[model samples]
Target: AMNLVSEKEFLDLPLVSVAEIVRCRGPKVSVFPFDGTRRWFHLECDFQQAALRQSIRILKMLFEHGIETVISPIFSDDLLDRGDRYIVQALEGMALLANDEEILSFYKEHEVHVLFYGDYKKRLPSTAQGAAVVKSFDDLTISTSSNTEHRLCFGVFGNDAAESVAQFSISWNETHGKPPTRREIIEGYYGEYVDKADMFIGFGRFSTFDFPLLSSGKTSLYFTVAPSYYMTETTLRRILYDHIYLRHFRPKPDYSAMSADQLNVLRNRYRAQPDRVFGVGCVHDGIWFAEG
Candidate 1:
């Protein structure tokens, strides 16, 4: 799903802003693992700062889809420097424990959840080792106090599969609908949401399955990167591609052991998928930013 695909039509998806994502649903309603926290810090690096913002946007999208918790992989070393910073706290939407023991204990007392990401190239052994691997999004689960246990499987239908929709809706109405909330729907159904959607405002890269798996009867499944506080898959790809592929005069970029053919293959592949290809923008006082 992660491997790239391209289309010139995907070139200008208007970028969504992190601010709007949070305003709609943040850690407050999403239920973060952290405890007490604050709300602000400044990043001196513009690009780096933007990356964090985009990541938040993605997280916000995930939360909307019924994923309320995440296993944050903040670097242990960097935690001392940036972990307690206001920005981290703000994004976390809660205060984190200074002690690692307490953090683990809290999860043990509560519920365990996944949605993993690597921090650069590092791995926190305690976090990654021996974790049970679940194969599909349907296996992931969640709960909230309207009073019930639920698995994760929220549905968002599109036009491509309209004929099947009425039947689908009827089934859903029987199980979790007639005004079923996102949480109820997810916990009620398993694994079929993908077969139900052609397009989704997902949190990360436009994985082939992220679209096609959910979109029945469609070959080229399309996705709009959900409003994120971090870089979308294509944007991140673009950043790296521009820096390395276009030739650098200084010190030079190591092409590693890749040959020209391999490098060109990567180049074409990267060029094929660009995430900021289309979206509506928000308007306010002289600026038009990505809408939530």
Candidate 2:
């Protein structure tokens, strides 16, 4: 019972200065965001094992990077297409259903939580045909009572819980007479939650900080993406240049390895001259470059 701090007592704990909170936690990354045209439930599932294999690789990548919890969408289980027949017939140990079973096993073994969404509990997908297979794995939830339960657990989004989060932030703003800075906001509502996890993983290019401004050296982060699609040096590096949300400066690379003359020679070789615009785009040494 040592770790059994109920939600009520947890909320009643003392508060720290908002400044201290932000100073420790850094900026709050945006949660799941839909591409302008796609719905949340859409993902390519043409080949079942192929799709599951891709997801496993991506999840493994995030786990390797210090992720400790996942905020999963309720529809994620229903998102990828499993043929109508597949979902109905999946049995835990059947070799024909191995891929689906493996995917389900991944979440259950990891920490996957379903937020309390009030009366919406019954709103989960119907179990009419092959759904018993999906339902069989539903008990995995995020809990602090046992450390071993989740070195990395996932939380499922529920409408009511989401609304509660919105309400908490709004009430906090009203009480403070100003909208909290994103960092302050997280501290007010989830200081403990943030403190416990190494990193909060996100999907999509939403509110992530490619150049995070963190007072705590340990602040870690994850972004949503398919590894096969975004793990390239060229593609991923461009994300660091997203100027709309990230901070203005990034850590400049050290050029101390070479002399100024060598640097200038390379610069001139690339025709690194001033441009009328703030940045330049060029091709040299068989590399294409754009800098701002």
* Winning candidate number (TM-score): 2
Q: For candidate 2, write residues 160-276 as lDDT tens digits.
A: 334545676788777988776766644433322333322333443323321112124333344534323234323322232231123333355568887999888888866765444
Cα RMSD to the true fold for all candidates: 19.3, 14.4
CA lDDT, candidate 1, residue 206: 37
Q: TM-scores for all candidates? A: 0.22, 0.35
Least accurate 10 contiguous residues by lDDT in model 2: 28-37
Candidate 2 collision pairs: 88-130, 111-152, 111-153, 111-154, 112-154, 113-154, 113-156, 202-224, 203-224
Q: What is the lDDT of residue 136 in candidate 1?
A: 24
TM-score attained by model 1: 0.22
Summing lDDT over every window of 10 consecutive residues in candidate 1, give the lowest-scoring window: 31-40
